[model samples]
Target chain A: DNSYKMDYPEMGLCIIINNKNFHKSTGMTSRSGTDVDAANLRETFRNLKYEVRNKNDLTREEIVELMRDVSKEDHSKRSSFVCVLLSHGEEGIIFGTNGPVDLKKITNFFRGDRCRSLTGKPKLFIIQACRGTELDCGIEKIPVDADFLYAYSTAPGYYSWRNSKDGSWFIQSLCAMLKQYADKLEFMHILTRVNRKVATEFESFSFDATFHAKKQIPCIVSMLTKELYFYH
Target chain B: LDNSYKMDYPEMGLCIIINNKNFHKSTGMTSRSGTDVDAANLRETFRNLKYEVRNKNDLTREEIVELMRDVSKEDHSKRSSFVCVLLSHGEEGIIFGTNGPVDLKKITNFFRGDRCRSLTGKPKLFIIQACRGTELDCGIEKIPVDADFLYAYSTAPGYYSWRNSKDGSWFIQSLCAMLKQYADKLEFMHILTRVNRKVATEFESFSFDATFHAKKQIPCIVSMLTKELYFYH
Candidate 1:
């Protein structure tokens, strides 16, 4: 009775926004090795029975409209929704191909009052974007962030890492956990394993002294009222 | 039970209640009139759950930091977890003691895995009852140190938490009630959600200020707990 009902007709839609090329005005370099992230996510969610849609290099306006369109769809047949945002960014905002977008703008489309079809359903936003320049750092009351979980690539007010060859640390670990444990453990426990893997397994190695040998930890902000499981 | 915390230690752990009232004139903070009731409620609740409860009132900022530092240094190898309740007036990132504002991060960093080795994989719960900001939630709404940490805020950020002059704070009252009823039977997170529901539905701000009047509130939970936590008997 305490667990969320994931027995709907469909698992849900998993929206992956992979922002690689950024406008010059945005002062963000192209995010290399993001395609690997997109592929891993697509495969993982597909196995979990979520219909995956991947978009790349979208402008801020396009991103907002995309989420709005998705929110407008009938989700009564679905159990949950997931949005994966891979981009370069700062605090409270993520970079688009053209400019910066406030995170709230992306999430507000799914609030219960506006999107009645998704009421009481889990709305997860997986943000693999840099929040700030700090190396390492550190919820919501139900309602604004209710039934929503934010899995941040790095702690708030810190930088997230990516490799030119491999994908970002957070996403790779997340995909692996989902692929391995989507059926066995509850979602929070899976995310906690992801956190542990990222924290203990990965470390930033850079030529710049400030960025060298740095540590990182993924942050999970959950307002979930019930235990979440992806058991088939 | 594999997902839950191991709560079979000889002692549950220390429950430190930092209850601040009677602020100094220079601090420009009003006295928290009903906090003692909350303090009493938390002390009895934790004690009933088999915790060694210590109540500290009207502490200065320095005293507050020193107390946490000292507590972190103690041996906790035999205990299962740690708990701290902060009752005071607060702003965005700071909590007030009797003398002035104290940085919330500095107070909590003491128990991080890097600093408090004895408590390194154990739960460290901080129950905070204070105003996070002046804003109020108009209905609809609406981490671990840096793991195993849970912050139970009385209200969401940039929102006011309500307290009655005689009945105690809505958050502490509900929290105590829920734990008293279900600590041994329910998971910690489930109990907190029940507390959230009780507070949101059972209380509303009665302030005379038009902006603040008739406002609703919900307690926020930021959990970095890796496992289910149950206060098993």
Candidate 2:
């Protein structure tokens, strides 16, 4: 009874926004390997019984429009809502193909006052984006921001590592954890394992002397009032 | 099969309280009229849980940093975990001292794993009873730089945290009430969730300023604690 209800007719819809390419004017690098993250995410959420919608290379306006469109849909039969953003970001802003978008704008459309049907339902956001430019370091409301959890790819003011061939350290580790423990563990515990895996299992190996041998760790920001379990 | 933190060390660890109420005139900050209630409430609450409570009032920015540095330097090998409660006026990501605002991160980083080796892997609970911003569920990171830490904020970002000249802050009061009732019966997160619910449902902003009156507030909990924490009796 303490856990969020996860036995709705459908698990829910998971919107995976993977921004790979940037516009010529934007000067942002294409997020290579993000497609791998998106693909793995789609498959993982699909296996977990979610209706996965994967969008790639969206502009800032497009990202806003997409979230607004999703927010307008009726979610009475859905158990929860998830939004995953894979892109380049700095501090609190995420880069779209053309420019930057306030991360809050993408999420505010689902506030309890905005999305009525989804009120009280768990809203989980998986952000595999750089939160800052630093290599290592670490380190709420309610009323509209309640019942949401943000799983960031790295600590605040730090870089999130990715493998050009495989995927992001965060996304790959996250997928592995979900695959192994989606049914057996609570969501926070699963995310904690992901944090540990990304922190201990991976390290940066850049040829740039300053970037070599750096480490990273994922951050979990939870405002949920109950335990979260993705139990089938 | 046990999932909670071990709470049976020789000591429960120090509970450092930085309670700032008065502000220097140059800072343009008003005195926090009721923070003393929060400080006293926290001292008793943590003491009841067997922590060695130490309350420092009206600290300057440098003094605040020095206090945390000295506390973090202590050998905590025989302690279970650490607790810090900061009661002061604040804006986004900054808490005020007697003279001016101090970066909240500066106070917390002293306890990081690389900095505080003795408490590395143990729970470091930070009860930040201050305004993060001016917002209202209405309301609502870091990586080694992150695990095993929890931040219990007084209000969501961009909003005001209501206080009473008589009763104390909604957050510290509710937090103390919950800890007194459930310290031995519930996990720390579960208890905090209860604190969130209590503050959200039981209290409302009653102020002369229309923007501050009848509005709602909810505490934000940023937890990176890897295991369940219990203040086992």
Candidate 3:
């Protein structure tokens, strides 16, 4: 039984996009405690031997520019790409300190037709942000862009819960799951379990009634061509 | 994770494939030709996986649901999991049961967590090789996400799941081919990835009409398993 396990470059890159500040004009409050999430993620990938790069508090244009630069790199030497975005958001858009960035703009840069060096390579995008308030609008387009995996914190239009002390629920659950299952399970299997943990274990806890007792569930859209087993 | 797609369980359960091919004239449905290929492939594959496989053809909607409900009532602690394969012309939320369209939810919900205690904690797998709507896939969005269940849809939403009236559907061909090649060694997701790769990169429509020619497809996998699935037993 010569089942093929995934092959990663001897070393790789994990980009951490932690946005804590917002512009005064956007009418959005600064997200507190995202730094903890960023720290955990940096450690997780660093322990996995990835060359982790952290970009803190960029504006929307800056996020797009950063991603474009990152995607344009010759990833032929790398096995995969991991992008972690923690910020504020609407249904299809996420924030970068000042304004909103369309996820498609960030991700489309790595499409098979565009990002040749990373074509056929696993490109994972893990996002932790508010999807929507009350309404769940998880915009899942199945396998549209090849070899890409999008992990959304909550289904579309659902509020992504965050705690000022413990970081956001989605990132914490994701980091713990990645830690527990990275070397043991396939990428999909680990993320599926992560989804289970987020959906079943946690609920929004806020002093405001509007934010209290709301439910959230994560979603995954996978177009990965190969199995990913992040080994130490 | 347990091999809800093929193996890993307390006991090896049954594989019942309800293949509906020939439709009534009044229904204006074309006669299904390549479905036997699917039936044959499933039976052989499940048999290889060491299950008591059964083939029941041309049943009404109620019969399909009743058959499943009755099957769900058995003591499944003796087996590892359950699998049902449906090959038929499908509507958005329903599939034709020969006599009429059946509510798919009613049939699959038979094994829901609270309902089918016999199969509790066991993998209740459903592999449906049919159209979901005007499209071939909804990536399991049409189905509710629940515990102990897995759904494999052949195409994405609003797209056609192509079948060669002579060669069978693009999905089952790649499915059987992948399972045949990797079932023993690869986990189900990896195998399905290869299946998606094969279908997406290999086959194309060669019809006279330009609208349906040379299009692409990718299989959708929706799982709610509590553990990793492997099939070596």
Q: Which candidate gets the maximum TM-score versus the true structure?
A: 2
lDDT of 3 at A143: 34
The sequence of per-residue lDDT tens digits that candidate 2 reaches over residues B122-222 is: 89999998887766423330236556788888887666788888889998999999999999898787788788778776776666977666677778787
**What local lDDT score does residue A194 receive in model 3, on the 0 to 100 scale?**
76
lDDT (tens digit, per residue) of candidate 3 on A167-186: 78778888899898788877
* TM-score leaderboard ranking: 2, 1, 3
Q: For candidate 3, lDDT tens digit of each residue in B100-124?
A: 7887777887776556676765577
**lDDT values, one for every candidate:** 0.83, 0.84, 0.72
Per-residue lDDT tens digits of candidate 1, residues A1-232?
A: 4677899999899999998888888677789999999999999999989999999999999999999999999999999999999998898899889998999888889876678788678889999999998764220023443576788887667888887688989999999988888889878778877876776677778798877677667777766666788984
Off by over 4 Å in 1: A136-145, A206-213, B1-10, B141-145, B200-210
lDDT of 3 at A206: 68
Q: DockQ of all candidates, in order?
A: 0.26, 0.41, 0.15
Worst 10 residues of 1 chain A by lDDT: A136-145
Q: Per-residue error at B51 for model 1, in Å?
A: 2.3
Clash number by candidate, in order: 2, 27, 20
Candidates 1 and 2 compared by TM-score, better number: 2
Candidate 3 or 1, higher lDDT: 1
Candidate 2 chain A has its poorest 10 consecutive residues by lDDT at A136-145
Report the candidate with higher TM-score, 1 versus 3: 1
